[PDB]
Design a protein around this ligand. Structure first.
Ligand SMILES: Cc1cc2nc3c(=O)[nH]c(=O)nc-3n(C[C@H](O)[C@H](O)[C@H](O)COP(=O)(O)OP(=O)(O)OC[C@H]3O[C@@H](n4cnc5c(N)ncnc54)[C@H](O)[C@@H]3O)c2cc1C
Ligand SMILES: Cc1cc2nc3c(=O)[nH]c(=O)nc-3n(C[C@H](O)[C@H](O)[C@H](O)COP(=O)(O)OP(=O)(O)OC[C@H]3O[C@@H](n4cnc5c(N)ncnc54)[C@H](O)[C@@H]3O)c2cc1C
Ligand SMILES: CNS(=O)(=O)c1ccc2cccc(CCNC(C)=O)c2c1
Ligand SMILES: CNS(=O)(=O)c1ccc2cccc(CCNC(C)=O)c2c1
Ligand SMILES: [Zn+2]
Ligand SMILES: [Zn+2]
Lengths: 229, 228
């Protein structure tokens, strides 16, 4: 038995992202997995890191330091509840899938705020206690990304450079940092430009990949994997 | 004369980021420059890309596509005023400085939201008009970043790898894409563990650099500069 959390960042249920999220729910549910979706836009998820995220006495109420205050709020249990709700889903999950359209070579801000606010010190990492010693060790994570640009544009030579370049702050800087083993990204290139048939193909490929997800090895999440040479 | 926009993303006025923003204001103001600050947290700036970003009736109210609807709204002058207030500051600016602490090897989400919502199609980029022909061509941009991690941790075989690796999505995928010339980043490593004196030193060097900012050449914003 496995638990999966899909952190989903798209405004439109009818989108190609919505379809990728739905096929993931359908296929994982079919296998008998436990499935949870955090539909960030539907939740009106708060993306800003503010003093509203701590409800207790501040450690230093004259100079606000978000990192310090949320680490302390975590240990004390005075974090805002929207944060702790997400931490419970993550804590219980064996696999976390992030489903989102690429926005400026990165995640939409609403999903960036989920990372900023949910993956706090004490919960996701400590100092020391990061990368291979991250607190979410033993967990899997997978970025399922859609793009405006074609596969060709995301090669080394390559108007945008290699797709793996923009994956670094996310796969390595965030997921590996917190101790996840990172599965290979699912990148569904340029659905807006693609045929009906090619879109159906991309959706079907994701579905079919999920059938055997539990048998995959993670990627070696390193500079060499991301940048080569 | 010149106009400078500082897009500033820190919750605390007494912070090191706050000091760097303040020094930038003081020095560019001293030079006679026109200076504007967008203090994102104090403005409670909306980070989410939503259908509220378009006023009046939508181009396609059946299936919402953020990119298409904001492109059409830009052309038809139907964007939410917070977005158009920012676009005006950017349009008039000669130089845009982003002042922010590194969050997950990127910008804090409030600032990511500024990028998502302000740099819309038709305003910042188009087909064509991206990278070198981006619609903001001729403007300068500069990332002024603070870090938790020491300079050593940001070497190609330090714990975090090379600084330039995380610079890529911001400098190239965003700033260069919109047509900005990118000046070299100002990176203030690990102010929290630095001495009182090293801090004052980092603040001063920023101020010093700003004295000759208009003499600078933009980096070659290439794959080679970042990774090779
Ligand atoms: C602020 C912003 C920044 C961006 N930055 C970047 C960037 O840096 N790099 C980049 O490459 N792109 C960028 N983009 C483009 C963006 O990544 C794409 O627009 C997005 O990935 C497309 O995904 P979608 O779900 O919205 O597509 P959709 O428009 O929803 O889908 C495309 C088509 O597929 C159809 N569809 C939906 N479900 C199915 C299905 N089950 N079977 C067949 N067809 C289906 C839809 O009807 C639609 O016609 C950016 C966009 C924005 C708005
Ligand atoms: C969600 C999140 C994600 C993060 N991700 C990363 C990451 O990926 N990589 C990374 O390296 N770090 C990361 N960090 C750490 C973060 O980048 C640092 O905490 C931040 O950059 C420090 O800058 P500051 O302005 O907040 O420092 P401050 O704590 O505000 O300043 C440090 C000290 O300088 C003092 N000071 C202020 N002004 C002056 C002045 N004029 N002269 C002398 N002293 C002064 C202050 O009083 C304080 O004592 C993350 C933090 C958070 C909260
Ligand atoms: C190099 N081209 S790309 O398709 O890999 C690409 C890169 C960055 C982008 C940033 C914002 C939006 C878009 C959507 C499409 N824009 C246009 C030009 O109509 C982007 C597309
Ligand atoms: C230890 N390595 S690091 O300094 O390069 C680094 C890397 C990623 C981080 C992600 C979230 C938080 C922090 C610590 C920052 N806390 C405060 C007080 O603001 C990080 C520190
Ligand atoms: Zn890694
Ligand atoms: Zn570039």
């Amino acid at each position: 038995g496995k638990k999966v959390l899909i952190v989903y960042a798209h405004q439109e249920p009818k989108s190609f992202n919505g379809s990728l999220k739905n096929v993931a729910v359908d296929e994982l549910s079919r296998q008998g997995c436990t499935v949870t979706v955090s539909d960030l836009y539907a939740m009106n998820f708060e993306p800003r890191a503010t003093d509203k995220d701590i409800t207790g006495t501040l450690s230093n109420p004259e100079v606000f330091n978000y990192g310090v205050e949320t680490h302390e709020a975590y240990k004390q249990r005075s974090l805002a509840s929207d944060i702790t709700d997400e931490q419970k889903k993550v804590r219980e999950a064996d696999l976390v899938i992030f489903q989102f359209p690429l926005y400026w070579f990165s995640v939409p801000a609403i999903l960036k705020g989920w990372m900023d606010r949910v993956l706090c010190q004490g919960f996701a990492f400590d100092i020391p206690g990061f990368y291979d010693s991250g607190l979410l060790q033993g967990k899997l994570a997978l970025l399922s990304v859609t793009t405006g640009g074609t596969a060709e544009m995301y090669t080394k030579t390559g108007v945008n450079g290699d797709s793996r370049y923009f994956l670094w702050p996310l796969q390595h800087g965030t997921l590996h940092f917190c101790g996840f083993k990172v599965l290979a990204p699912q990148i569904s290139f340029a659905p807006e430009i693609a045929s009906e048939e090619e879109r159906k193909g991309m959706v079907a490929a994701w579905s079919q990949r999920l059938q055997t997800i539990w048998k995959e090895e993670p990627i070696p999440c390193t500079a060499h994997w991301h940048f080569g040479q």
